């Protein structure tokens with residue numbers, strides 16, 4: 019018996035969420051459906067144009083850890099906030115979910131990361147992220163005991179943007195593999211992949227990463243192709259297990275030559291896609307660490323993803339375990 | 349032409365919102381459906397026990413101002429936040445809605461007020477409020493020109509708790525009436541009424557308040573009666589106009605011997621009653637300052653109240669003006 023099923027590592031972010039029209043994104047040069055990095059001045063400027071907003075704890079990996087805890091698994095998180103009110107909110111929400119979160123803040127400055135997320139009428143989300151205190155995450159924040167005692171350690175491709183987080187991840191991969199655990203990553207965002215394509219491929223080809231999460235856009239970007247079938251063949255050659263999401267078309271789980279197709283759940287309405295991929299990973303990694311089949315991991319993923327997109331905010335406000343019990347997936 | 353239709357004055361608060369079970373309120377001796385004042389120590393203690401939460405700008409009068417602006421009226425607000433992240437959030441949200449908000453923070457401590465609002469399965473809300481920087485609101489925060497230039501100045505009964513706010517209110521009343529404007533209050537909460545019963549009756553009887561908002565519980569508390577008909581007759585005798593809400597039973601508007609009953613909108617499901625009274629006041633006061641009939645003001649109030657109770661959070665995320673146009677209220 020081990021202390022943790024899933025440790026996740028990411029940019030610790032609080033989300034500031036508002037609805038906008040399509041022209042708002044165009045007028046403000048915001049790349050739709052993407053993570054747009056911004057500096058402190060741009061953050062002030064954007065906020066000055068944003069409508070009344072709602073705040074909720076975010077961070078892709080943060081969301082994923084919370085989702086595993088919600089489903090009933092044992093989760094931990096590494097990610098750096100500041101000693102400020104936003105950081106206290108982030109700390110509260112993740113711990114209150116029953117995630118082990120012990121990363122110490124280094125001061126009040128830079129302040130806690132925030133992301134202004136604009137949701138359009140079609141339910142797509144466009145994120146505008148000031149990394150703030152995330153830039154300080156480094157090898158010093160690796161709790162080696164936690165990595166040693168987690169079945170899976172999972173991290174964001176997004177971590178390649180801040181300067182020293184990658185060093186922490188290399189320490190994680192070493193500790194994880196020394197203790198016979200598995201490493202996982204998400205490709206995070208298609209432009210993120212464009213920035214770090216070579217480095218991501220190397221993580222997979224060198225065996226530092228065992229399980230890879232991607233959506234259609236990220237897989238196409240990884241191989242710079244318009245051919246989805248080619249991307250699927252190539253990603254299967256590059257990592258031991260690949261979980262590839264395709265929005266309303268569900269997901270495909272690949273292992274060697276094995277392919278497992280899973281359907282999207284029936285949805286009332288796409289309210290807000292924020293966290294869909296994060297919660298897919300929650301469902302998948304929960305199933306995975308519970309010894310479930312890869313198909314059943316896929317189903318658990320589509321379930322969590324389906325639930326999160328029908329609400330505003332990135333972390334399901336309802337019991338995932340209850341839904342899984344109701345859905346016949348338990 | 350006047351610069352403002354409605355100026356509101358209240359405790360400037362950010363809400364921290366979570367769902368709980370019935371036993372949680374009992375275990376923590378939280379009075380259900382009430383505003384429970386708390387100190388800094390109790391705030392920390394309650395937060396430690398609270399689940400994952402969502403934050404949104406609140407304050408009863410702040411909400412009412414936001415609602416007036418959403419409907420298309422011209423609104424202003426007085427209320428005091430600290431120079432901190434929560435204060436920056438509050439400032440952003442109210443200004444982003446098109447409310448004039450120019451109250452200057454006086455420092456970083458006490459920090460910006462927050463209320464931990466626990467929403468039970470029945471959709472009822474139980475608020476736990478640390479006043480923080482609200483305690484510093486005083487005569488120095490009265491923008492004389494704003495009061496002089498507002499058709500109605502509306503204020504919270506809740507303002508009787510912090511020490512100096514009442515002085516600002518008496519200043520508003522003098523300026524408003526010197527400029528031929530009208531003053532309005534809400535009774536806010538039945539325990540608030542219990543704390544300040546003599547004072548509230550004096551405000552009405554002396555004519556410092558022209559228009560009073562009450563719900564059934566507040567009206568019963570004001571006269572310490574179980575007889576609602578008695579409460580209605582007495583409130584009508586004590587103020588020029590009284591607007592009395594009865595939850596699902598709608599509302600009754602009283603002027604001298606005139607009574608105008610309005611039906612509550614019929615509801616799919618009550619999600620979170622937070623903001624119902626506040627937004628009833630938004631609709632009513634928007635109607636009132638547009639020269640509408642007392643019944644139509646009640647109609648507009650019930651429309652806004654019905655919309656806010658079908659969403660999480662205290663300020664409607666949808667267009668009240670659009671809803672009003674669809675409703676033939678325009």
Ligand SMILES: Nc1ncnc2c1ncn2[C@@H]1O[C@H](CO)[C@@H](O)[C@H]1O
Nearest residue numbers: 029031076077078133147176293332
């Ligand atoms: N650069 C980033 N790194 C990690 N997570 C991010 C970044 N930008 C936005 N997010 C988070 O992505 C989540 C949705 O996947 C949001 O909750 C948001 O907080």
Ligand SMILES: Nc1ncnc2c1ncn2[C@@H]1O[C@H](CO)[C@@H](O)[C@H]1O
Nearest residue numbers: 359361406407408463477506623662
């Ligand atoms: N003491 C208080 N004074 C004014 N408003 C309050 C108080 N406590 C809670 N509220 C606000 O009441 C609103 C709901 O009517 C919530 O948005 C909350 O912020």
Ligand SMILES: CC(=O)NC1=CCC2=C(CC=C2)C1
Nearest residue numbers: 263265266268282294323324
């Ligand atoms: C796999 C995934 O991300 N989940 C989903 C994303 C979008 C979407 C669904 C169902 C309909 C639209 C499910």
Ligand SMILES: CC(=O)NC1=CCC2=C(CC=C2)C1
Nearest residue numbers: 593595596598599612624653
């Ligand atoms: C008059 C008013 O406040 N409107 C309503 C308040 C509460 C409530 C309704 C319908 C069900 C609960 C309508």
Ligand SMILES: [K+]
Nearest residue numbers: 290292326331
């Ligand atoms: K969402």
Ligand SMILES: [K+]
Nearest residue numbers: 620622656661
């Ligand atoms: K509400």
